[PDB]
Amino acid sequence: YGQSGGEQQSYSTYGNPGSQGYGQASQSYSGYGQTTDSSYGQNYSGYSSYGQSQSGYSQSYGGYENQKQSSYSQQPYNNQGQQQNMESSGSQG
Amino acid sequence: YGQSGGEQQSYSTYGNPGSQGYGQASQSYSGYGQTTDSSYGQNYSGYSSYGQSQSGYSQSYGGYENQKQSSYSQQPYNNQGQQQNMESSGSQG
Amino acid sequence: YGQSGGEQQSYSTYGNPGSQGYGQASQSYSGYGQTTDSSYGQNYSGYSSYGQSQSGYSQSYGGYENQKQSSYSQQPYNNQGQQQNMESSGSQG
Amino acid sequence: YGQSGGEQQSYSTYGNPGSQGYGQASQSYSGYGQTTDSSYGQNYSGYSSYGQSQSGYSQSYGGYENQKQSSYSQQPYNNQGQQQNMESSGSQG
Amino acid sequence: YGQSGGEQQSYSTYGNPGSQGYGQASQSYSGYGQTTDSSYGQNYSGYSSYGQSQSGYSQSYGGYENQKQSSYSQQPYNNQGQQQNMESSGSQG
């Protein structure tokens, strides 16, 4: 068995991800068929090439700017980061 | 058995990830078929090439700027980081 | 058995990761089939090449700047780092 | 058995990681099939090449700058680092 | 048995890691199949080559600068480091 308290998870991405998977992907083979000279796939996100395919994938991006001041800025304030606060959330027999 | 308190997890990325997987990927073979001269795949994120495929994947990015001042800045304040605060969250028999 | 208090985990990346996996990937073979002259894969993130594939993956990035002042800055303040604070979170029989 | 207090973990990376794995990867073989002249893989992040594949992976990056002043800076203040503070978090019978 | 107080762990990297693993990787063989003229792998991060693959991985980076002033700086202040503070966190019978 196992007993755990509450759970907080936080994810932040500042940038261009090529692909993102968040959910559940399942691929199961419980049968007893024949796969011969073949290929099969599950592509949840991103890029899969199989069979006798001929393909190409290009992703091109310009620049990325985050919390940026161009010339002649007067006392800019830029704040970022992660803060975790936990109280009274230990374990007790 | 196992007993744990609360849990906080925080993730931050400042930049361009080629691929991100966050969720659950499962691939199971419980059957008893034949795989002969074949290939199969689960691609959750990112890039998979199999079968007799001929493929290519290019990702190209410009620059990245974070908490940046161009010329002639007067007393800019740039703050980042991680702070963890925990109180009264130990274990007790 | 095992008893633990609260848990805080914090991750920060300032830069371009080629691939990131955050979640759960499981690959199981509980069956009793034949795999002959074959290949199979689970690709959670990043790059997998198998079968008889011919492929290529290129990632190209420009520069990276973090907490940066161009010329003629007057008393810039740049702060980063990690701070952990723990109180009254030990163990007690 | 084992009893522990609270736990704080903090990770920071200033730079371009080729691949990052954060979560759980499991690969299990509990069956009794035959793998002959074959290969199989789990790729959680990063790069796996097997089967009869022919592949290549290139990652190219420009420069990296962190807490940087270009020419003619007046009394810049750059601060980074790690600080751990612990109070009253020992063990007691 | 074992009793421990609170635990703080802090990791910082200023530079480009080729690969990073943070989480749990498990590879188990509890079955009783035959692996003949074969290879299999778990790649959590970084680079694995097996099977009859032909592959290459290149990572190329420019320079790295941290807490740097270009020419003509007036009284720059650069601070980094690690500080650990512990009070009243010993053991007691």
Residue numbers in the entry:
A (entry chain I), B (entry chain G), C (entry chain A), D (entry chain E), E (entry chain C): 7 to 99
Passage from the reporting paper:
In healthy cells, FET proteins are mainly localized in the nucleus and undergo nucleocytoplasmic shuttling. FET proteins have roles in transcription and in the splicing, processing and transport of RNA. Surprisingly, we found abundant amyloid filaments of the FUS homologue TATA-binding protein-associated factor 15 (TAF15, also known as TATA-binding protein-associated factor 2N) rather than of FUS itself. The formation of TAF15 amyloid filaments with a characteristic fold in FTLD establishes TAF15 proteinopathy in neurodegenerative disease.
TMEM106B filaments were not observed in individual 1. Perpendicular to the helical axis, the shape of the filament fold somewhat resembles a scooter, with the proximal N and C termini representing the two handlebars. The filament fold contains 13 β-strands of between two and eight residues in length, which encompass 57% of all residues. These β-strands, together with their counterparts in adjacent TAF15 molecules, form parallel, in-register β-sheets characteristic of amyloid filaments. Consistent with a protein fold stabilized by intricate hydrogen-bonding networks, the high-resolution map shows that the TAF15 filament fold is well hydrated. We modelled 23 ordered water molecules per TAF15 molecule, each contributing between two and four hydrogen bonds with either polar amino acid side-chains, the backbone or other ordered solvent molecules.
